[PDB]
Amino acid sequence: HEPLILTAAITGAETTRADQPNLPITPEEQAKEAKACFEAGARVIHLHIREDDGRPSQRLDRFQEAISAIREVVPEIIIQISTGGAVGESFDKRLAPLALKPEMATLNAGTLNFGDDIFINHPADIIRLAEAFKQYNVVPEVEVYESGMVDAVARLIKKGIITQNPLHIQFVLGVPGGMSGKPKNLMYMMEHLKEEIPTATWAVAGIGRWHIPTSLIAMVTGGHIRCGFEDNIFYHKGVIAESNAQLVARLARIAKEIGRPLATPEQAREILAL
Amino acid sequence: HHHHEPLILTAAITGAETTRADQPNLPITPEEQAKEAKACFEAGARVIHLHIREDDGRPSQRLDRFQEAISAIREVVPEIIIQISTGGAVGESFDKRLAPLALKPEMATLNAGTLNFGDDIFINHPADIIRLAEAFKQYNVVPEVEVYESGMVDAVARLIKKGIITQNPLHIQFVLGVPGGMSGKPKNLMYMMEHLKEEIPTATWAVAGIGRWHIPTSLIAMVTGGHIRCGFEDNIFYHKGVIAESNAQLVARLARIAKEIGRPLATPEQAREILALN
Amino acid sequence: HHHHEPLILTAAITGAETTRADQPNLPITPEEQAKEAKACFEAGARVIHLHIREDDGRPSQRLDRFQEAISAIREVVPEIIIQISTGGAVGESFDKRLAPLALKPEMATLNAGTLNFGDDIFINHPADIIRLAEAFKQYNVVPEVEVYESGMVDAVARLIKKGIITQNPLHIQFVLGVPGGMSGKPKNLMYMMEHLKEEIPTATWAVAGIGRWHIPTSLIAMVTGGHIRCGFEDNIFYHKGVIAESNAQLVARLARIAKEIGRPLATPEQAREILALN
Amino acid sequence: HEPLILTAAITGAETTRADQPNLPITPEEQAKEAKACFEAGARVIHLHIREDDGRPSQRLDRFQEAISAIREVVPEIIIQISTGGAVGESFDKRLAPLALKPEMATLNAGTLNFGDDIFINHPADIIRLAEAFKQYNVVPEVEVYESGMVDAVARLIKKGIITQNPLHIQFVLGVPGGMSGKPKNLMYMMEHLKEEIPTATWAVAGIGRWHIPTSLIAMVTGGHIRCGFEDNIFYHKGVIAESNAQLVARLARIAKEIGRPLATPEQAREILAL
Ligand SMILES: [Mg+2]
Ligand SMILES: [Mg+2]
Ligand SMILES: [Zn+2]
Ligand SMILES: [Zn+2]
Ligand SMILES: [Zn+2]
Ligand SMILES: [Zn+2]
């Protein structure tokens, strides 16, 4: 019965147009998808940007273009920019777009092996990013891939480095190298978070095949849900999705079947302390 | 992966306690139960969990009335599995609860313990559990073992060790949300499936969520390989404060959610195979 | 951190079922119980969970005999907390189980549900649970609420919501390992403490592990802030196949383990504060 | 009732002689400590080496000296060499001592932030180390700091990269950056491992204040236990330990109190598939 906030992670850094022909790459494509997602029930867009050639971008001008396009089509949507970017990107380039003063942005809470590579978040870089969030008055969404990252975040809170309260945690489950999205895991994580950061709220992203199991557990445990091509390009096993909005709409339908209302924009901002 | 695990839906259409005053759509007579069973089957149900009533709504244990209901359902929907309750109504004698196994249904419930049950006690004395287990062997009926608490899993495992229950694979029905029993919160259903895997590794399972626990138990079962029971016996509401129109309406919602997520419904043949009814 | 959580040890010295034939060292008479209570206190126990017996070993509920035992224990060890059982023996009437609250002990048990209990049923009808809860208020006695299954936690939480139990903080005693109840495996004790934290956030807890579950429950409790019950009522063996020499021997082992790990034993004053007995 | 294998991690890479005056640094000191630990109940020594000045070493000659000294005092002990070394050490230097053909050695299963630094185990380096274990016929002890590392190891098993069965996993709990040693966590990890790698055996190391909680849970769940100055220099809060053997002996006493037998050398080798 608690409202449900749906996030659409519409582009990401890695997904190709060859694999997912409906992948939005340009600001205009991203705005069109954001409108469809909003109408389907999404209240947050998790935003990565691309150059026209499809390579990942960290350019401030390009971020401003995408943010402006999305805002103009759906002024009420929450635009959450990524500070993760493409694995391997320099930390300075990942941090810089906070200067655009978005409403929300991601804050990655640890390092992990990530497929064939390593997604690096050095402890000193986490601290400097956390300080930049404060300086630009941006509300973090803290990305957690493993149990230990919750404790790490709790220590940064204790030290006064992360002062946001309530803090919003995004469990990102199913990375090869990170915690999987099996139900035991999501239950463990929400309970672990409740022990360590009792006032934190949470959402879950389930990569690939973990999208459905994470979503259905979150539905009935008060959690919020992320979906989209950044995490999963398939609507069913072996069946490419038509759009990010198709993925959002399924979650909206399930919420309607079970009687869990979707958050209004106002409710989403209240819950996320925006 | 859920795309490869057939889902068995059970409709517990009548029960012992639900009233026509609370749920105007409650099926009471054999004819009414047959009609509802057919609609439930068409909506995706493969098992009916059957209690019977007299025409005036009183719970019954009579063998003639059980046969009337069984035959009515079989005549219109022979494909569905008719699972007889041996739990019956509040305070019923154990003799009357056991007797209908002599009708040789495909399946019947075997309650695995005693618990406080609302304002009363649902009594299953250890010696009676044993004689009921013996009756399942005598009459060649497959049990569905009803579990309301952790310790009932251990109790069943002891009966298996003692050779009192030899059915393998054994089917366990978690019944969660009784006032006096374990609730249907997600932590609990996760705990129970994992506990069952430790104690009875080859057992299969279903969950029934009483009242407000219907939705949480169903969605967890969807994505953990469990099977799902619904129906007026357990829950008369489609949403909080919104009475369900029929048992089939409840079944159809579960079928729609399964279809959304790509989990196939068991065919009658698959339901019988999974439950070891052939 | 365990170095800062006092540990309350309870000795359940006699019980209703344990026999002198199995355990030659079992204390039966008030004098024997007093001697054992003193030795247990010296070994680290702060609470005695008291059942009484007639001289021939039969379980008793008589108020004159309860007063005799209580007084005998108080005379030699006034510091120990004497917690009266209201569970009593197999099949005992609820009237006789309730009556000793009129003796106004510091603490008494309040059994939170019915369960199969070995070959019998331990009956706690919902209406009787309520009238016992009412008696705790009438006689100004603090309850220790005995929980054998998950659903009993929910039942207690409902009585708190209804204002039937107003004791706060409430002390819960998990009793794990009864045949018919939840076992004392580590998964279970972890689940139960976490479930209790969700449902009754301010409750404190202890664990009793019947038989082979004594060691697993004790070591988990040591490092999770729980308190620990031991004694012949629950377990007559020091090791598998090795009879315990006394209840104090069991208490002393727990005290030694606490000392090894640096967890302090509660003083009598701390035990009373924690249990809200002042 | 199942036998208990105690491991003594006697030296490590970071502990100083100033903080723990009884820290063994030289091969001779390490041999003396190993004998005392063996007599107290230890069946495995987890071995890091130091130069005489106390800096961490990866020199093959120095490893051979330590291995020889320990072997000569207690021929029956199992000598498990570390391939973790000091955080920041080159992977080539970490891998090289496998050429000495020890009975067992550690195999770190992932990257994590580790205090102020990052303990790096690139996916390609994990693979090459796993292949070297096979080439030198060394049995791994696989070090796991987070849930996701279990899945990662399971994938390497599926691919035939890790073929050891039964595989021995060491949960290392309490690193700042890794999973903590709280009871919920250890219970979760043993159950998660049972789901993902059903025939694996396990031990736990609890860093610092997590030594006691991890040990007592392991005692009664069939797990094995690591202790020692590498992980914890305190016998009680604020009370420096006298020796690694003191730490081992407490665990032996608790095992004796509860009736869990210590593994004989033969039993330890059987359990660990040596
Ligand atoms: Mg399109
Ligand atoms: Mg010395
Ligand atoms: Zn992203
Ligand atoms: Zn029924
Ligand atoms: Zn008692
Ligand atoms: Zn090491």
CSV table of N, CA, C and O in Angstrom, one decimal, chain B residues 14 48 55 57 121 156 212 222-223 239 250 262:
chain,number,residue,atom,x,y,z
B,14,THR,N,-14.2,-22.9,-0.7
B,14,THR,CA,-15.3,-22.8,0.2
B,14,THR,C,-14.8,-22.7,1.7
B,14,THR,O,-15.3,-21.8,2.4
B,48,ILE,N,-8.4,-28.2,-6.8
B,48,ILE,CA,-9.4,-27.7,-5.9
B,48,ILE,C,-9.2,-28.3,-4.5
B,48,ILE,O,-9.1,-29.5,-4.4
B,55,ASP,N,-26.6,-27.6,2.7
B,55,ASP,CA,-27.3,-26.6,1.9
B,55,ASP,C,-27.4,-25.3,2.7
B,55,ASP,O,-27.4,-24.2,2.1
B,57,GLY,N,-25.3,-24.0,4.7
B,57,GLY,CA,-24.0,-23.4,5.0
B,57,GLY,C,-23.2,-24.1,6.1
B,57,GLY,O,-22.0,-23.8,6.3
B,121,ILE,N,-8.6,-23.7,19.2
B,121,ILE,CA,-7.4,-24.5,19.0
B,121,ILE,C,-7.8,-25.5,17.9
B,121,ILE,O,-8.8,-26.1,17.9
B,156,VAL,N,7.4,-33.5,10.7
B,156,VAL,CA,7.2,-34.2,9.5
B,156,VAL,C,8.5,-35.0,9.1
B,156,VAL,O,8.4,-36.2,8.8
B,212,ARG,N,-4.6,-10.6,4.3
B,212,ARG,CA,-3.6,-9.6,3.7
B,212,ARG,C,-2.3,-10.2,3.3
B,212,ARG,O,-1.5,-9.6,2.6
B,222,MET,N,6.1,-16.8,-6.7
B,222,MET,CA,6.2,-16.7,-8.2
B,222,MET,C,7.6,-16.9,-8.6
B,222,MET,O,7.9,-17.5,-9.7
B,223,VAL,N,8.6,-16.3,-7.9
B,223,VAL,CA,10.0,-16.2,-8.3
B,223,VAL,C,10.9,-17.0,-7.5
B,223,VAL,O,12.1,-16.9,-7.6
B,239,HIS,N,-8.9,-6.8,-3.2
B,239,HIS,CA,-8.0,-5.8,-2.6
B,239,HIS,C,-8.5,-5.5,-1.2
B,239,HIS,O,-9.7,-5.8,-0.8
B,250,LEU,N,-9.7,-14.4,-8.4
B,250,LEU,CA,-8.5,-14.6,-7.6
B,250,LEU,C,-7.4,-15.4,-8.4
B,250,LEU,O,-6.3,-15.0,-8.5
B,262,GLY,N,6.4,-14.4,-17.4
B,262,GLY,CA,6.8,-15.5,-18.2
B,262,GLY,C,6.9,-16.8,-17.5
B,262,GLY,O,7.7,-17.7,-17.9
